[PDB]
Amino acid sequence: TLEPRGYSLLIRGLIHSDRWREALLLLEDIKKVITPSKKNYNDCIQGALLHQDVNTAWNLYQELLGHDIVPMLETLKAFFDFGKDIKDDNYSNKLLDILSYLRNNQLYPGESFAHSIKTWFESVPGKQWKGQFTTVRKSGQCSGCGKTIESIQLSPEEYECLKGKIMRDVITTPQELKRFENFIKSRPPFDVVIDGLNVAKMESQLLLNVVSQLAKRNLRLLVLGRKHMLRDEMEEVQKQASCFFADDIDDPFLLYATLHSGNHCRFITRDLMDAKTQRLFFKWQQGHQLAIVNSKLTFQRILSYDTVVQTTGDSWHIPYDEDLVERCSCEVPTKWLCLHQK
Ligand SMILES: [Zn+2]
Question: According to the record, how does the cofactor bind?
Answer without folding.
Answer: Binds 2 Mg(2+) or Mg(2+) ions per subunit.
